[PDB]
Amino acid sequence: RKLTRALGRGEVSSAKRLEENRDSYTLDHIIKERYPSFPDAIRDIDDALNMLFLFSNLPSTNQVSSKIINDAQKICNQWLAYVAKERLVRKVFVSIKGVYYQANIKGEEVRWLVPFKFPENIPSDVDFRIMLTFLEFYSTLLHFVLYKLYTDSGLIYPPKLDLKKDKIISGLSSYILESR
Amino acid sequence: AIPRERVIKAVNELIKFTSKPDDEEELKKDLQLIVVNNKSFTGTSKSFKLKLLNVKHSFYKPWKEASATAVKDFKVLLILKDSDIKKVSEDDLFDQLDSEGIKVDEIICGKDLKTVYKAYEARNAFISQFSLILADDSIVTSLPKLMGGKAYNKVETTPISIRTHANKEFSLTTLTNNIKKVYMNQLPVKLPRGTTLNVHLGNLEWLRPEEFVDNVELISEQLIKAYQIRSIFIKTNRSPVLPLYYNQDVLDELESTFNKGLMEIANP
Amino acid sequence: EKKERLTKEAAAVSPKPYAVKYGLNHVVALIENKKAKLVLIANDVDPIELVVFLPALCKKMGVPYAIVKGKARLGTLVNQKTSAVAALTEVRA
Amino acid sequence: VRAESIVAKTLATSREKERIKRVSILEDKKAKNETQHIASGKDFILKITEGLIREKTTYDGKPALLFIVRVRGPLAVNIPNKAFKILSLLRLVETNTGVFVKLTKNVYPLLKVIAPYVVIGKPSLSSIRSLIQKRGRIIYKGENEAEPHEIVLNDNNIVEEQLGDHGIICVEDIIHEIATMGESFSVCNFFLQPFKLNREVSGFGSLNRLRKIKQREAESRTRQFSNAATAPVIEVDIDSLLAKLN
Amino acid sequence: EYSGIIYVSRLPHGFHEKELSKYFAQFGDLKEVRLARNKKTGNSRHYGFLEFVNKEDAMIAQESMNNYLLMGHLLQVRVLPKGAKIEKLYKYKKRVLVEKGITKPVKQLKDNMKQKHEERIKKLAKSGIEFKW
RNA sequence: CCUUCUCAAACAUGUUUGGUAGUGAGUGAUACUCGAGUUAACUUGAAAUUGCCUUAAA
């Protein structure tokens, strides 16, 4: 309401200052409330992985933003790089829907699905607001899980990325995982 | 090129003609050179770039010296780029041109021309008060739209393109050297699209007749190699002309990558 | 942006500013002293006696005036919620 | 319709037509290559990168791969016939549309002509792969269908049966040929439909209007219309532009 | 009385015949639109005339645009009195120059310029000027 | 209710070549080249009565 008032009055600099002086909500306390146990978080991150890998392959539309897509792609690349470095994969399956991977994460079996790199068409008959809310929750949960996994394995979180390697191929090799 | 005795006699007779006994007492003492060319100087395309003719004797410094007893004094305007107006101040010109007695009264830029003097009346009042206008060679191409067409109706209000950049960077030394060279050695001449070229030599009271003779001899010597001229005349305002040159032989000359790129960008 | 000027003046120790003149008493005094080039008077003033004498005063002092709709519009002009009057006194070249 | 709008449109269209006429005359003189009077006789590329730096260099003449994005042009300007024809041939009839262009000596004057309506960049391999794997569409005709319809580039068998004579097997080979500018590059480029991107700012709430204001300020800062008939071709960070628009 | 003829003046640079017709077609049907232009160049003289099929529409257009501030120009619109039709306003273009033929031979033109030089010599002698040749 | 060609190469900070086509109206003398092109300078509120592409969207 105050930003609308500033824009209606024509004080663009005041509107910019109002936009700069704002704070958004976080879901860390809700994550801690819902998953008191790291084994519970490990048991439940499978749906998070599925949702994030699905959303990373989607193109940007009016409802879904490039920032959200890039965040999902970045966190998926971090998870893939962690699994590849710690050498935890156990099972693979290449089905017509996509590639299922089963890995061993802290003694628990985690199975997730990765789509193929093809331009999937949006049906425009689903609840994108609901899916984006779930995506935000899953992003916070996987941020917590990945930070704890990196700290337990003895790796820096978040890992730095190689810009030239990312401009070559934007994959899991962009992020180089360091020790201590 | 020109007989010394003939040109001396012509200049002395024309300076005797003025002294027989508003603008009537003032405009009649300006010496004019008429150059008649067999063809047009430029051709089918107009030209506003004033040609600079080098002479041994100074011309603008006598104008400044003799303008102290006139209503409209001699003034210098300098037009430079917007990105380079901040590198130069009045003191930068003063400490580099104080020895030669050269003073630049006002320095403006394109932003000033497009904001402060945008109105026609104010722009005319600002432009008409200057006598020597110098402009950067980079910005001189934008001047017909900014300064307007009235400034191009006179020789003095037409800007002079000067070299200000050395090694593709702004050079105060190069700018000052070009201003000094224009002020001391060279004179501007307006090239028409017709056959009649008019050169304003100045005023009889400004310089001695022998200095005028030297200036006109060097001007003729330069213009003979510059163009295939036909006739040369010397006159004063409200006075007839006197010929000084004649030649005959030069009159004997009187008688698709675009589609390739389209095909390249097109599929068939 | 006023605080940006004060810090700059403290470091040095500023050009002449041009701004819209506002405030009823200030504008009336400017009109009486013949300093206002142009006056804008809001039409929806309550109580109306605050501005009901302004056109006659401007006419007597030879100050060009115009009645405009919106004290809220004049307020947006002078960074206020409302403004009964606005005045232009000095302008740039 | 307001007379101010009509007069502004007429003046802006006249200035644009004058600029196009001057560019056309200069490029005709360059094509003739026997003109004594000319301002400059070579090609300039001006790279603007990010507090922004600009580097002006001479075009080496070697062919290059450019990504071209159609944007909304100058305010109150009707597009002249030559620019409209070039855009229609390049399949950029609407904004938020991107194509690939093989830049050569004949292509450079076309870029000079259509400069104020396009954003031109040097795309990276990752950007090209993201563009094709995220927004890849073709026009395909079925055996049991009377009229073809646009579909996503999802079948490698379709690419095999359409471009198998030239040696193109799949989308990866399409990407390789586009990036390397080898044989059948134009064939693959016109096999792919022009890429329909999305706007960086969408909506008309207060936040989105502020984002629009910031975007317009940044666009005015980056893209500059010289209108000098010899202006260098502007090259921007097309990687970051594609990151914002995809 | 009053006619259906509108005289417009203080028009900006971009206001021409087509712009005037397009703008005042919204006011009413226009029989003829003309603009005063220079003869040698295709530049307007910043005034023109329009004709309405309806004099009431012409009066409405005048009372709408009589004191309209447009791009720094205060447009001036008047209704012409009874009669006085508009005429002799040709749409000029930017005229071009070209070199024509010279049928006078070299010898004849040399003789003509020599005769002109002799006439100049005679004038110099007449006007009390003592110069050689 | 838009905003105006803000420069290039050649040689050794210097020399040379190319790059600049305009608000309208009026006053005016004076010469030059074949109804055409040029030629001292004075006024003016941006003045004026007729030379036959759509997310800058509702």
3-state secondary structure B247-266: CCHHHHHCCCHHHHHHHHHC
CA of C64 to C1' of F2 (A): 31
Question: CB of A149 within 8 A of CB of A38?
Answer: no
Compute the Cα dihedral for B148, B152, B157, B161 and give only its sign: positive
Question: CB of A159 within 8 A of CB of A176?
Answer: yes
Distances (CA, A) of D5 to C29, C52, D53, D80, E6: 41, 38, 36, 18, 21
Tokens coding D85:
């024809």
Judged by phi (left if over 0) then psi (alpha if -120 to 50, else beta), residue B233 lies in beta
Question: CB of D246 within 8 A of CB of D130?
Answer: yes
Task: Kindly report the length of chain A.
Answer: 180
C52: closest CA of chain A, how far (Å): 27
What's the rounded Cα separation, in Å, for the pair B9 and B2? 12
- Pairing assessment for the beta strands B76-80 and B106-109 based on DSSP bridges: parallel
Q: Are E132 and B255 a contacting pair at CB < 8 A?
A: no
Nucleotides of F under 7 A from a protein CB: 1-9, 13-16, 18-25, 29-34, 36-57
What's the rounded Cα separation, in Å, for the pair D220 and D112? 19
DSSP state of D227: -
Q: Which of E11, E19, E67 to mutate to test the interface with D (most CBs of D within 10 A)?
A: E19
Q: Is the peptide bond before D63 cis (omega within 30 degrees of 0)?
A: no
End-to-end CA distance of chain D: 37
| Residue C79, phi then psi, degrees to nearest 5 | 60, 45
Q: Tell me which protein residue sits closest to nucleotide F40, measuring alpha carbon to C1'.
A: B237
DSSP state of B28: G
Q: Are B258 and D89 a contacting pair at CB < 8 A?
A: no
**Cβ-count burial B165-178 (b if 16+ within 10 Å, e if not):** eeeeebbeebbbbb
Q: CB of residue B96 closer than 7 A to nucleic acid strand F?
A: no
| Residue B262, phi then psi, degrees to nearest 5 | -60, -45
What's the rounded Cα separation, in Å, for the pair E112 and E109? 5
E101 → chain B, closest CA residue: B255
State the chains in contact with C (3 or more Cβ–Cβ pairs under 8 Å).
A
Task: Kindly report the length of chain B.
Answer: 268
- Pairing assessment for the beta strands C21-22 and C85-88 based on DSSP bridges: antiparallel
Of B167, B177, B91, B83, nearest to B134 (Cα)?
A: B177
The position carrying tokens 């009431």 is: E56
What's the rounded Cα separation, in Å, for the pair C8 and E121? 77
Compute the Cα dihedral for A18, A19, A20, A23 and give only its sign: positive
Provide the resolution (angstroms).
2.4
Q: Tell me which protein residue sits closest to nucleotide F5, measuring alpha carbon to C1'.
A: D228
Chain C contact for A11 (CB, 8 A cutoff): yes
Q: CB of residue E70 closer than 7 A to nucleic acid strand F?
A: yes
Cross-chain CB nearest to D152 (options A61, A119, A167): A119
Question: CB of D87 within 8 A of CB of D93?
Answer: yes
Question: CB of D153 within 8 A of CB of D132?
Answer: yes
A-C interface: how many C-beta pairs under 8 angstroms? Answer: 4
- Other CB atoms closer than 10 Å to residue D70's CB: what's the count? 22
Torsion of CA E80, E86, E90, E91, to 10 degrees: 50
Q: Do chains C and D touch (3 or more CB pairs under 8 A)?
A: no
Q: Do chains E and D touch (3 or more CB pairs under 8 A)?
A: yes
| Residue B145, phi then psi, degrees to nearest 5 | -85, -30
Mapping DSSP onto H, E and C, the string for chain A reads CHHHHHHHHCCHHHHHHHHHCCCCCCCHHHHHHHCCCHHHHHHHHHHHHHHHHHHHCCCCCCCCCHHHHHHHHHHHHHHHHHHHHHCCEEEEEEECCEEEEEEEECCEEEEEEECCCCCCCCCCCCCHHHHHHHHHHHHHHHHHHHHHHHHHHCECCCCEECHHHHHHCCCHHHEECCEC
Q: Are C76 and A9 a contacting pair at CB < 8 A?
A: yes
| Residue C36, phi then psi, degrees to nearest 5 | -85, 125
Amino acid letter for position B115 = T
* Experimental method, per PDB record: cryo-EM
- Pairing assessment for the beta strands B241-246 and D195-196 based on DSSP bridges: unpaired
Q: After which residues is chain C broken (C to N over 2.5 A)?
A: 13
Q: Are B248 and E110 a contacting pair at CB < 8 A?
A: yes
Chain B, 127-146: which CBs lie within 7 Å of strand F?
128, 137-146
Distances (CA, A) of A13 to C5, C81, C83: 16, 18, 22
Q: Which residue stretches of chain D are H helix?
A: 3-32, 81-89, 107-113, 125-134, 156-163, 171-180, 185-191, 206-222, 238-245
- HSE-CB at C3 with a 13 A cutoff on CA atoms is 0
The alpha carbon of residue A44 and the mean position of all alpha carbons in its chain are separated, in whole angstroms, by 15
Contacts 24+ apart (CB under 8 A), B15-24: B15/B204, B15/B209, B17/B236, B17/B239, B17/E129, B18/B204, B18/B236, B18/B239
